[PDB]
Design goal:
Chain A: This is Cytochrome b-c1 complex subunit 1, mitochondrial. Chain A: Belongs to the peptidase M16 family. UQCRC1/QCR1 subfamily. Chain A: It comes from Sus scrofa. This is part of a larger assembly, with chains A (120 residues) and B (80 residues). With 120 residues, chain A is an alpha+beta fold. Helices cover 14% and strands 25% of the residues of chain A. Chain A is built from 2 helices and 6 strands; from the N terminus they run E-E-H-E-H-E-E-E. By secondary structure, chain B is mainly alpha-helical. The longest helix of chain B has 39 residues. Chain B is elongated and about 90 Å long. The N and C termini of chain B lie far apart (82 Å). Classes of the chains: A alpha+beta (120), B mainly alpha (80). Strand 1 of chain A pairs antiparallel with strand 1 of chain B, so a sheet runs across the interface. Bound molecules: cardiolipin. Cardiolipin (CDL) binds next to helix 1 of chain B.
């Protein structure tokens, strides 16, 4: 019902051969590099970092989520405790280094981006 | 002294990049050389005249001592 009723006004306007096969999006080499800003007035430091990851189409990304699941997540708003099922979390419950931390996983179809994102 | 109490610098936007990516000797030749000469002359332009001073003091002092020492018997005429 959503198929037939779906509009198909202007037709697709693109090639169907090898000529249109060239990517509209470049393969992208990773660049392990650092960018820093010092606005000291900022109430506190907010740091993130990223390693090169699997392309989004790539299944290789899938196991890494379980790996990310080892890192888990934590924040001060939770019930807290050093007992909890994460090291960085209990350290955050200890020296209070991480007000919060989290492992972002933004994989693009070309090349992905694993990484960490946190408040200290 | 730590990093926590050095100075309250504000905005700065750094852009470092990994050594592993970049070459160890980027334009190290043709770009490095002119700077070398450029600053070499920057040192010698001031430093050199002391070198010449020590040079003339050295040479003239040495020849001073030698002429003062070896030439003497001829200058004496003990046969006087
Ligand atoms: C007897 C036993 C004596 C032992 C003495 C050991 C020498 C001491 C030493 O290694 O430090 C001096 C010095 C330390 O390096 P420096 O960068 O010149 O010092 C910076 C200072 O701000 C003062 O230098 P500056 O601020 O005027 O400018 C530094 C510049 C000029 O300073 C100089 O005097 C050096 C001149 C030649 C440059 C050396 C590179 C050689 C190629 O030196 C450069 O290297 C130019 C920049 C090139 C960068 C290119 C890199 C690619 C990117 O190196 C020497 O000059 C070696 C001198 C040894 C020969 C003495 C002969 C006397 C007779």
């Amino acid at each position: 019902q959503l198929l037939d009723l779906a509009q198909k006004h202007f037709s697709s306007l693109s090639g169907t051969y090898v000529e249109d096969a060239v990517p509209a999006f470049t393969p992208c080499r990773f660049t392990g590099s650092e960018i820093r800003h010092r606005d000291d007035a900022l109430p506190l430091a907010h740091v993130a970092i990223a390693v090169e990851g699997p392309g989004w189409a790539n299944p290789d990304n899938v196991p890494l989520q379980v790996a990310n699941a080892i890192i888990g997540h934590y924040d001060s708003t939770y019930g807290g405790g050093t007992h909890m099922s994460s090291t960085l979390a209990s350290v955050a419950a200890t020296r209070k280094l991480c007000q919060s931390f989290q492992t972002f996983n933004i994989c693009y179809a070309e090349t992905g981006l694993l990484g960490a994102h946190f408040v200290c | 002294r730590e990093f926590g109490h050095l100075t309250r610098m504000r905005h700065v936007i750094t852009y470092s990049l990994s050594p592993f990516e970049q070459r160890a000797f980027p334009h190290y030749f043709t770009k490095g050389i002119p700077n070398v000469l450029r600053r070499t002359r920057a040192c010698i332009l001031r430093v050199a005249p002391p070198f010449v001073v020590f040079y003339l003091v050295y040479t003239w002092g040495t020849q001073e001592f030698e002429k003062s020492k070896r030439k003497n018997p001829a200058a004496y005429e003990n046969d006087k």
